[PDB]
Each structure stands twice: as structure tokens, then as C-alpha cells.
């Protein structure tokens, strides 16, 4: 890098935070990581994309030591870039989340009854996570359902209310915001799915370098500036982890019908 900041690739799948404020927040996060980890300022810089399709190019080009990706991107790229976890976020005491399929009250009693019906949600653009992980490989979403992707869970839930959609797959945060019309009910709750945090290329980092970054993130949410960043994303803390935390997901990821 010859004195330039080292790149940290951030593949932001999307979320409650708009792209521009999420990108700014990554820069702010790195400034806190540097302070709490006692790096000189501008040791790192964020290379940000909200496009899943560009994540791979950014990884190959920037050759980053550290990155932030979705679980699906990690599982797909882990072998090529010898990726290992650095930290997971803890949210509401848990390092995992559950997805809920909701539908108008009384219409459907199980997912099998939604076969051939139309599904909405914000995580439908990349349906291998929906099929292999959320549904534990019991359904092939593109074959068994009509996936109507949405960019905002509000849009999907409006369509459900109208009757333009039969059910909506919701994250924890989206399921919490439901209250804020037609009666609805949860038709399906996923198993616990681990949360992604930061990862590292183990061919480009030492174990001790990963540990320093991890420890910095473990203390980030206590910092005056870091606290506001963890609030923005609803994060309780970050926790350092070994690779086995995602081994159960790797088993689901390999399964095919
Ligand atoms: Cl996920």
C-alpha cells in the first residue's frame, strides 16, 4: 500500500440504513477501530458496494485483509479467499436471527400450502440463501414459488395487504416493524441462522493481526463514537469467533435436491 490506507471491502446486502449513510458509517466505524485498536489514523479505508454482483470483483481487485459480506457471499467465497470469521454481531443477546413467513390470518396453515403461490420480501433477489438456509433445503424457492422481490419490506407488506402477494418473508427487524390492517399470522419460522460480521483473508493476515482487529471491534460499541454506530445498526456488541460458528451453515449450503 506504500503508506496508503489498507482497503476493507464492504458488501452491504442492503438494510434499514440507506446506502449513503451506511457507506459513511463504515468510514466512521474504521476511524473508531483505529482509535480503540491503537492504529494510526487512516490505516484503513472502506471500499463500499451495495451491489452483490460487484463484491467478487472488489475482492479480487483490492485483495483486502478484512471484509464485510452477507452469509451467502461468505459461504460462496470462503474457499477462494481463505476467509475466516473475525467477529459476529450480538443482537438482542443472540449471535443468530430467525426469518418469519407471514400471511393473512386463516389463509395458509403451512409452507406446503404456499407452494405455487407468490412470495414477497427483500431477500428474494438471491434465492439460494432463501432455499438452502431459511427453508433448510426443504423448498426450491424459484421452482416451488413465484418470488416477487421487493426493495422495502413496506412495499411487500402493502402488496400482501391488498392481496397482490400471498405471503412475505421478513427479517427480525422487518417483523418487529409490522405493527407500525388485514390480520396477519406467522406461517413459518426458520431455524436460528448465524449473523455475519467481519471476515478476514487468512492467506493475507496473521492470526495475531486478526486478533487485534477482533479485539478492536469487541470494544467498538463502548466508544463514544462507536456507540452511535452500533445503535444505528441495532448491535449490542461484537464477539470474536473461530470458523466453526458457520460450519452448520456450510452443511446446509452443500445440500441439493
Ligand atoms: Cl442471513
Amino acid at each position: 500500500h506504500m503508506g496508503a490506507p489498507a482497503p476493507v471491502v464492504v458488501c452491504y446486502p442492503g438494510g434499514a440504513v440507506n446506502e449513503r449513510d451506511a457507506d459513511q458509517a463504515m468510514d466512521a466505524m474504521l476511524r473508531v477501530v483505529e482509535r480503540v485498536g491503537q492504529w494510526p489514523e487512516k490505516s484503513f479505508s472502506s471500499v463500499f458496494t451495495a451491489k452483490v454482483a460487484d463484491c467478487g470483483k472488489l475482492m479480487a481487485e483490492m485483495k483486502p485483509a478484512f471484509a464485510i459480506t452477507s452469509l451467502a457471499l461468505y459461504l460462496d467465497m470462503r474457499g477462494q479467499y481463505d476467509l475466516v470469521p473475525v467477529v459476529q454481531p450480538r443482537i438482542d443477546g443472540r449471535t443468530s436471527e430467525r426469518y418469519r413467513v407471514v400471511a393473512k390470518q386463516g389463509r395458509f396453515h403451512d409452507m406446503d400450502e404456499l407452494k405455487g403461490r407468490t412470495l414477497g420480501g427483500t431477500m428474494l433477489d438471491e434465492p439460494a440463501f432463501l432455499g438452502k438456509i431459511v427453508f433448510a433445503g426443504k423448498y426450491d424457492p424459484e421452482k416451488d414459488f413465484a418470488l416477487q422481490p421487493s426493495r422495502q419490506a413496506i412495499r411487500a407488506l402493502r402488496s400482501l395487504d391488498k392481496g397482490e402477494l400471498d405471503a412475505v418473508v421478513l427479517n427480525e427487524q422487518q417483523f418487529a416493524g409490522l405493527s407500525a390492517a388485514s390480520p396477519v399470522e406467522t406461517v413459518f419460522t426458520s431455524a436460528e441462522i448465524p449473523l455475519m460480521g467481519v471476515v478476514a483473508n487468512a492467506r493475507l493476515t496473521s492470526a495475531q493481526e486478526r486478533a487485534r482487529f477482533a479485539q478492536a471491534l469487541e470494544t467498538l460499541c463502548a466508544d463514544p463514537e462507536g456507540r452511535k454506530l452500533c445503535d444505528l445498526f441495532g448491535i449490542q456488541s461484537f464477539v470474536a469467533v473461530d470458523p466453526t460458528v458457520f460450519d452448520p451453515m456450510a452443511r446446509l449450503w452443500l445440500a441439493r435436491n
Side-chain angles (χ1 to χ4, degrees):
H1 303 311
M2 239 188 56
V8 178
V9 165
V10 181
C11 307
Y12 187 50
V17 179
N18 70 90
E19 156 171 349
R20 294 180 66 170
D21 286 331
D23 178 16
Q24 253 151 38
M26 297 304 171
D27 294 325
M29 177 201 69
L30 286 175
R31 296 294 84 72
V32 177
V33 165
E34 289 166 350
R35 163 163 67 261
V36 299
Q38 302 176 284
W39 277 275
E41 298 159 32
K42 313 230 201 218
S43 288
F44 301 95
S45 69
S46 169
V47 183
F48 179 101
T49 183
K51 300 175 176 213
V52 169
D54 281 331
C55 192
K57 163 167 136 113
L58 285 178
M59 297 292 299
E61 287 180 348
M62 287 294 183
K63 306 176 192 188
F66 298 102
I68 289 155
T69 76
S70 69
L71 178 59
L73 286 159
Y74 168 77
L75 296 166
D76 280 334
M77 299 194 298
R78 180 196 41 70
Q80 170 166 6
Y81 296 107
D82 218 324
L83 299 177
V84 296
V86 179
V87 296
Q88 289 183 274
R90 194 176 294 282
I91 298 173
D92 191 20
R94 300 172 279 122
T95 49
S96 61
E97 61 184 341
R98 287 189 291 157
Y99 287 73
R100 289 172 185 80
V101 178
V102 298
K104 275 185 195 214
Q105 198 158 248
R107 303 298 178 84
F108 309 93
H109 307 122
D110 61 64
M111 289 306 305
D112 286 318
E113 292 180 26
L114 280 163
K115 286 206 275 216
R117 311 291 260 250
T118 191
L119 256 175
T122 66
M123 67 291 300
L124 273 55
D125 278 320
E126 178 266 311
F129 172 76
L130 179 59
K132 297 177 167 274
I133 304 307
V134 172
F135 291 134
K138 162 182 255 279
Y139 301 110
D140 194 318
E142 300 194 80
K143 325 305 180 216
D144 298 337
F145 308 116
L147 301 184
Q148 174 172 308
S150 300
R151 278 145 47 260
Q152 298 108 2
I154 285 156
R155 173 56 34 74
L157 292 167
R158 297 319 189 176
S159 297
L160 179 71
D161 201 10
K162 304 328 196 226
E164 302 170 300
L165 270 168
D166 294 307
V168 180
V169 189
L170 297 171
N171 297 325
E172 287 273 9
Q173 50 138 295
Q174 300 171 333
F175 186 77
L178 274 167
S179 58
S182 67
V184 286
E185 67 190 15
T186 297
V187 177
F188 172 87
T189 302
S190 72
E192 294 186 322
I193 296 154
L195 299 173
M196 289 288 338
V198 175
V199 299
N201 180 323
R203 166 174 55 80
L204 301 178
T205 58
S206 74
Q208 303 73 39
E209 284 153 17
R210 294 188 292 273
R212 182 182 183 185
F213 210 88
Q215 288 176 8
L217 293 162
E218 288 182 306
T219 67
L220 180 136
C221 294
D223 180 274
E225 305 313 316
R227 169 198 315 140
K228 316 305 168 48
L229 298 163
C230 300
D231 288 349
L232 168 65
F233 296 102
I235 295 183
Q236 185 178 24
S237 187
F238 291 99
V239 300
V241 293
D242 75 14
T244 69
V245 296
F246 299 120
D247 280 349
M249 289 310 97
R251 170 169 180 187
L252 292 173
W253 200 241
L254 189 68
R256 278 184 69 80
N257 292 333

